[PDB]
Design a protein around this ligand. Structure first.
Ligand SMILES: OC[C@@H](O)[C@H]1O[C@@H](O)[C@H](O)[C@@H]1O
Ligand SMILES: [Ca+2]
Ligand SMILES: [Ca+2]
Ligand SMILES: [Ca+2]
Ligand SMILES: [Ca+2]
Ligand SMILES: [Ca+2]
Ligand SMILES: [Ca+2]
Length: 182
């Protein structure tokens, strides 16, 4: 049985090779078991400096969510996270606005909805809108990585045409698509 919690299933991977793009991070994910798992219940991480994969920087980055880490990973030069689960969204139009260093990819119901396929110092991108056809728990996954240096990841979502944005957190996240009461 997979645990039911109000969050996404989180996996952290570190490496001593360079992460330049999404494909490099996905290859890392596919190469081994996660270096740590966690519950991603408040997806607003960092900012910090001096490499996410070093020392206690991952704990600092994950903040509130770090108390669910399965282990304290050892040092690596580069690292990132893979998150997967469900998010409750009513039918309608939405768009992401993401602050990040380095890059990332977010997909909903299998379709990319926010992508930066390269390294970058902290930058905020307002992404194009997408539609949700039916209200309910939508499948969502996220990739984010740090190639080194500074690191931050905050993917906010608007349901009202960019007037207001919210962080994805325990109000609407579900690890399995069942309703959490936690
Ligand atoms: O590639 C752009 C560049 O600024 C990279 O160096 C870093 O320190 C920063 O966090 C970013 O990853
Ligand atoms: Ca894996
Ligand atoms: Ca560590
Ligand atoms: Ca924090
Ligand atoms: Ca906590
Ligand atoms: Ca690197
Ligand atoms: Ca960086």
């Amino acid at each position: 049985p997979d645990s039911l919690f109000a969050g996404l299933v989180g996996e952290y991977y570190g490496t001593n090779s360079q992460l330049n793009n999404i494909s490099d991070f996905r290859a890392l994910v596919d190469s081994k078991e996660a270096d740590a798992t966690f519950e991603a219940a408040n997806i607003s991480y960092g900012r910090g400096s001096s490499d996410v994969a070093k020392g206690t920087h991952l704990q600092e980055f994950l903040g509130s969510d770090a108390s669910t880490l399965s282990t304290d990973p050892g040092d690596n030069t580069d690292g990132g996270i893979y998150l997967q689960g469900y998010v409750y969204l009513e039918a309608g139009t939405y768009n992401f606005k993401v602050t990040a260093d380095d890059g990332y990819e977010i997909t909903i119901n299998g379709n990319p909805v926010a992508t930066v396929d390269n390294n970058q110092s902290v930058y905020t991108v307002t992404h194009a809108s997408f539609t949700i056809s039916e209200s309910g728990y939508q499948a969502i996954d996220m990739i984010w990585w740090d190639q080194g240096g500074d690191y931050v990841f905050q993917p906010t979502l608007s349901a009202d045409g960019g007037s207001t944005y919210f962080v994805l957190d325990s109000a609407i996240l579900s690890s399995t698509g069942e309703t959490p009461y936690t």
